[PDB]
Amino acid sequence: KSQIPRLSAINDLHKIWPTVEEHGAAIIESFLSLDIVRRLNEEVDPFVKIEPIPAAKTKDHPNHILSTTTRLVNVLAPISKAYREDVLNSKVLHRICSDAFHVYGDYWVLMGAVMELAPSNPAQPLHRDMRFSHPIVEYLKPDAPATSINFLVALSPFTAENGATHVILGSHKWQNLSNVSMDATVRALMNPGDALLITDSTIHCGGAETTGTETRRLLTITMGISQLTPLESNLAVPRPVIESLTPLAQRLLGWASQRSAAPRDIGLLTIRGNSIEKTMNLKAEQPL
Amino acid sequence: KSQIPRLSAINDLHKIWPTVEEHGAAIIESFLSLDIVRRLNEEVDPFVKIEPIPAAKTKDHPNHILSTTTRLVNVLAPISKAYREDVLNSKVLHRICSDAFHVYGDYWVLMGAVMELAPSNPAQPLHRDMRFSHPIVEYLKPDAPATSINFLVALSPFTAENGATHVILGSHKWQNLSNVSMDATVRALMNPGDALLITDSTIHCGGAETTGTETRRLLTITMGISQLTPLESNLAVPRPVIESLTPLAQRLLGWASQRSAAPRDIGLLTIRGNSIEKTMNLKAEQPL
Ligand SMILES: O=C1N[C@@H](Cc2ccccc2)C(=O)Nc2ccccc21
Ligand SMILES: O=C1N[C@@H](Cc2ccccc2)C(=O)Nc2ccccc21
Ligand SMILES: O=C(O)CCC(=O)C(=O)O
Ligand SMILES: O=C(O)CCC(=O)C(=O)O
Ligand code: NI
Ligand code: NI
Structure with a gap:
């Protein structure tokens, strides 16, 4: 069985989304x-x-x-600071997301989280993401373009023995889930800074930590269309922090209005025909 | 052709959602x-x-x-004050919405707007709502339960001559839209305070104002599942106003976390496992 496609962030940028579209997963x-x-x-x-x-x-x-x-x-x-400046303005992330979500319109962060798995963490059951927060996603037609994607970024080494993520290639197109088994999986072996990119339909799971010594850490960035509600709120983030961000980062955290791809789009999170950012006179790129 | 079903808000409360489910429209x-x-x-x-x-x-x-x-x-x-207190806490609205959206989970206000049509306002083209803001909705399976509904509340008289809303009964179940015509419509004749309730799949339109003298006004309340992003933002609403509301009204305006109907729901707009309201220490029902 074939391995997860590996792509350069520097050289193969235009190939990343087409690859995930075809196979359900790619390592960046x-x-x-x-x-x-x-x-x-x-x-x-x-x-x-x-x-x-x-x-x-x-x-x-x-x-x-x-x-x-x-x-x-x-x-x-x-x-x-590294998250809000470097990660939220990642040229690579934004090219992939605009490739992925152009049919729908604007996208934002549904959740950005650090996950740390302690030694001897068992494998997760095989699953698709979004089923414990967005029941709506299960009612989408089979050929509907993915409405969210997940960047699973290695913050420490991902190995077979320390619980590297499992994915079933092609499983994003599966309707019948009778052949779902760990026998059908391949592993995301990754160095720190590499990212496994999957869709909301890719069947996958965290692996078993089998050493009893290694702590595995990742940054999971679920990016999704602005028409879906985030799992997390930035409503309590201090205004000085928000005003330190780029306008793009502000939009990703729900501190801006949003647009759909409809030809005569009427907008999301608007205030009597005007944007959040105009109405609240929200500054951008003001150092702390 | 049969008219839009008319129901009592006082007596027929349990019948309202089943009626809309069957016919695509009901007058409350x-x-x-x-x-x-x-x-x-x-x-x-x-x-x-x-x-x-x-x-x-x-x-x-x-x-x-x-x-x-x-x-x-x-x-x-x-x-x-009447909107934020009486309308947002309407027992009738909340029973209908909980009947409608129980499969998905929590619901909130996608948009609450007053619309005023000047004399000689032409008829709108026949349409389904949500297509200029939520392209995602078109990708839902035909039998997916409605993810939003619209209460079109008369704030002045709705008559045939002054542009009363047109609806096509049964059109919420239509997939082929070849028979869409004004010939297939019936009218929502309404006194002030009556509400026409439709789904996001009901084909309808504002009518032609033909008198040249009458100004028609309505309150349109689009209620939708908390998994979909509102058309409007309450982010700029002063905290004293928000803290004057009930917890339920706060949730409807996006000033609370939200829950899906998944058995082990992980929540929407949460902050490291805690709600917005807990994290920000948000008061409720504090008079201005
Ligand atoms: O808690 C999360 N559950 C998953 C689903 C799942 C997790 C473990 C075992 C079975 C299913 C999810 O749907 N979304 C995310 C996304 C980022 C981080 C965590 C989660
Ligand atoms: O502007 C709005 N367009 C409609 C769609 C429409 C309106 C007129 C003519 C054709 C289509 C919509 O999708 N949502 C709403 C909902 C409440 C109030 C206004 C609108
Ligand atoms: O642990 C992993 O690598 C995968 C985690 C995951 O799929 C999840 O928590 O949703
Ligand atoms: O004018 C009306 O009664 C209907 C309005 C409407 O359907 C809309 O604006 O979306
Ligand atoms: Ni997962
Ligand atoms: Ni309409």
Whole structure:
């Protein structure tokens, strides 16, 4: 069985989305530079350590899906300068997203999260994303273009023994799910900064951590059309932080109005025919 | 040809959604009381008068669909006490919406707008709503439950001669649109406070104003699943106004996290497993 296609972020940029469209998955080598990975890790480190279990009793929106050996930290903009500046303005991410979502219109971040898997974390069951937040997605026609995609960025090494992600190639086009098995999977072996890109229909899972010593970390960036509601809110992010961002980054975090691809688009999150950014007089690129 | 079913808001409450489900439209008699209509009208009056044309050059999100003899005013919460208190907490609206959207989960306001049609306003072309903002909706399977519904509330009399809404009964189930004609329509004749309820698949249009003297006004409330992005933003609504609302009204305006109907729902607009309202310490029902 054939492996996940590997593509250069520098050279093969126009080939990335067509590849995912065909196979359901692609590995983007050096999606983030090692410098960006280093700064991202440093900035999120303490927030990963203080994060409780996903289904902690203190939470009013507990995650009952993820294992107790998973830690997930979202709403990264206020935590990480590298995220809000480098990741949110990634030329590669934006080319892929505009290739992917042009049929629908504008796109934004549905969730940007760091996930850290403790030693001996078991494999996740094979799944498609979005089913515990957006039931609407299951009612889309089979040939509907993907309404969200997920960049699974390695922040530490992904190996077969430490739980590298499994994917079933071609499974984004499957309607009958009788042949879903771990026998049908291939692995996303990745160095830090490489990204596995999948769609919301790609059948995949986190792998089993089998060493008992290694901690695997990733940055998962679910990008989706602006017509779908994000899993996370940036409503509580301080205005100085928001005003430090580019207009594009502001749009990605829901601090701007949005547009569909309809020829006479009437817009999303508008205020009596005017945008959020015009109405609130929202500055951009103001240093902290 | 049969007329639009007419139902009591007081007596026939459980019958309303089943009726719309079957026929694509229903008239809810006295959906709003005359007192609520009176206060709503008084409060929005000046904002309708100052509103420019829908496609005004001053706007960065112009509406190129609506006629120059239409005035549309949305983001009503800061304008109208009657809207934000009485309309947003309507027992009838909430029963219908929970009946309609239980398969998907939470719902909210996609747009609440007052529309005023000037004398001699021409008929709109026959259409389905949501096509100039949510291209995603066209990619839903034919049997997918409606993801949004529209309450067209009469704020002045709707008559045949002054442009009462046209609907094609049963058209919410149509896939082939070859028989779409004004010959297939019936009218929503309504007194102020009556509401025409349709789905996002019901083929309908505003009627022709033929008197040359009468100004027709309506309150259009598009309610939709919380998984779809609103056409309008309440991000710029002052915090004192938001904190005056009920928790339910806050949720409807995007000032709360949201839930899907998935058995192990992980939530929408959450902040590291906690809700917007918990994180921002958002008060509710604090008088101005
Ligand atoms: O919690 C998340 N569940 C997944 C689904 C899933 C996870 C584990 C096992 C089975 C299913 C999801 O739908 N979305 C995301 C996306 C980014 C990070 C976490 C999740
Ligand atoms: O501008 C709006 N266009 C309509 C569609 C339409 C209107 C006129 C003529 C043809 C199509 C819509 O999709 N949504 C709404 C909903 C509430 C108020 C206005 C509109
Ligand atoms: O652990 C991984 O590599 C995959 C994680 C994943 O698919 C998820 O949490 O949704
Ligand atoms: O004018 C009416 O009664 C219908 C208005 C309408 O359908 C719309 O503007 O979307
Ligand atoms: Ni997943
Ligand atoms: Ni309409």
